[PDB]
Enzyme design. Structure first.
Site, PDB file in Angstrom:
ATOM      1  N   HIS A 151       0.843  -1.209   0.000  1.00 48.72           N
ATOM      2  CA  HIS A 151       0.000   0.000   0.000  1.00 48.72           C
ATOM      3  C   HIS A 151       0.876   1.256   0.000  1.00 48.72           C
ATOM      4  O   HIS A 151       0.536   2.265  -0.605  1.00 48.72           O
ATOM      5  CB  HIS A 151      -0.890   0.049   1.271  1.00 48.72           C
ATOM      6  CG  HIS A 151      -2.107  -0.793   1.179  1.00 48.72           C
ATOM      7  ND1 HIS A 151      -2.057  -2.170   1.277  1.00 48.72           N
ATOM      8  CD2 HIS A 151      -3.400  -0.470   0.973  1.00 48.72           C
ATOM      9  CE1 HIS A 151      -3.272  -2.664   1.132  1.00 48.72           C
ATOM     10  NE2 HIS A 151      -4.117  -1.638   0.948  1.00 48.72           N
ATOM     11  N   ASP A 206       0.658  -8.046   0.502  1.00 46.10           N
ATOM     12  CA  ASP A 206       0.807  -6.640   0.861  1.00 46.10           C
ATOM     13  C   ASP A 206       2.248  -6.300   1.270  1.00 46.10           C
ATOM     14  O   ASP A 206       2.455  -5.541   2.253  1.00 46.10           O
ATOM     15  CB  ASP A 206      -0.163  -6.232   1.964  1.00 46.10           C
ATOM     16  CG  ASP A 206      -0.321  -4.725   2.092  1.00 46.10           C
ATOM     17  OD1 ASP A 206      -0.198  -4.015   1.068  1.00 46.10           O
ATOM     18  OD2 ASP A 206      -0.535  -4.263   3.224  1.00 46.10           O
ATOM     19  N   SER A 253       2.265   2.284   9.791  1.00 45.24           N
ATOM     20  CA  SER A 253       2.094   1.273   8.777  1.00 45.24           C
ATOM     21  C   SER A 253       3.351   1.183   7.895  1.00 45.24           C
ATOM     22  O   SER A 253       4.009   2.210   7.619  1.00 45.24           O
ATOM     23  CB  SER A 253       0.865   1.566   7.989  1.00 45.24           C
ATOM     24  OG  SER A 253       0.806   2.944   7.699  1.00 45.24           O
TER      25      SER A 253
END
Length: 296
Positions: free
Chosen positions: A45, A81, A162
């Site tokens: 992401h 991811d 993140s």
């Protein structure tokens, strides 16, 4: 210095800010130095928009000392991811120490560490709340949605940490924070990172099935919504409205676990799928295809 203060401080130099800018837009996440030659891991992401539009984005990495360096995308896997970046000819890198996620236990204290200089940076603390927990993640760009088998934590995972590491009390990386928090476990990260470094790509198994979750007294599991023409599933005799309850050696509670379980199958090898069909229990055989035939 406090217990968590010391651990956060010990790993800070291994954590980096990853910034992607075009003349219209500018996004930022964290990542962790995993190899002294300058290989950096983040989640997919964080770099997705740049990877999809490389002609308009520039990606840099900012170190704990404040140095800003250009960074190249080595490869990425939207299905787990994860992504790997490379910085060239930077010296005296503080490489993260990678733990063993198979030794992690529920209740273990953790830090979810974001990069110290990021704009929104956070460091949070909690415990491991669950292991091997399938969790759906929405794809960022035009990226496909996926499901990963995660470490769940009650450490808050947010914009500010993140892509950063989930750190244990030995100051070792036990996972990568995703975009009530979840981390990609470090043992899976290592396997995917190795592959992306060599090949710039990872090849996962596919069956050609989309499922919806069903839970009731007759059969709970992943109910077959669609089967692709010509797919392993088609060829193996999987039918729509079949309720899949086991894929290979893994029981399947729902559509999320179905996605993860498929990815644990061997490409090109026969494997059992257990199904409940019109009240009857049926075992089929499927030979998974590679999702990327030319890199297999």
């Amino acid at each position: 210095a406090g217990r968590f203060t010391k651990v956060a401080a010990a790993v800070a130099d291994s954590v980096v800010t990853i910034e992607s800018v075009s003349d219209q837009e500018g996004m930022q996440g964290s990542g962790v130095i995993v190899d002294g030659r300058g290989y950096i891991v983040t989640n997919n992401h964080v770099i997705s928009e740049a990877a999809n539009n490389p002609s308009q984005f520039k990606t840099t990495v900012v170190f704990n000392d404040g140095k800003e360096v250009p960074a190249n995308l080595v490869g990425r896997d939207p299905k787990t991811d994860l992504a790997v970046l490379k910085v060239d000819n930077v010296d005296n890198l503080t490489v993260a120490r990678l733990g063993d996620s198979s030794k992690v236990r529920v209740g273990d204290e953790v830090l979810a560490v974001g990069a110290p200089l990021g704009l929104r940076s956070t460091v949070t603390q909690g415990i491991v709340s669950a292991l091997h927990r399938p969790v759906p993640l929405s794809g960022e760009g035009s990226d496909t949605d996926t499901v990963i088998d995660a470490i769940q934590t009650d450490a808050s995972i947010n914009h500010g940490n993140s892509g950063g590491p989930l750190i244990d009390m030995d100051a070792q990386v036990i996972g990568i924070n995703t975009a009530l928090g979840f981390a990609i476990p470090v043992n899976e990260m290592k396997l995917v990172a190795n592959s992306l470094i060599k090949d710039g790509k990872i090849v996962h198994p596919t069956l050609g099935i989309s499922t919806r979750s069903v839970s009731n007294a007759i059969a709970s599991g992943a109910q077959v919504a669609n089967v692709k023409a010509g797919s392993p599933a088609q060829k193996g005799g999987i039918l729509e409205n079949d309720v899949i309850v086991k894929v290979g050696n893994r029981a399947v509670a729902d559509s999320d676990e179905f996605v993860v379980a498929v990815r644990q199958l061997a490409i090109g090898q026969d494997a059992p799928i257990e199904v409940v069909r019109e009240g009857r229990h049926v075992t089929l055989t499927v030979k998974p295809d590679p999702d990327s035939t030319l890199e297999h």
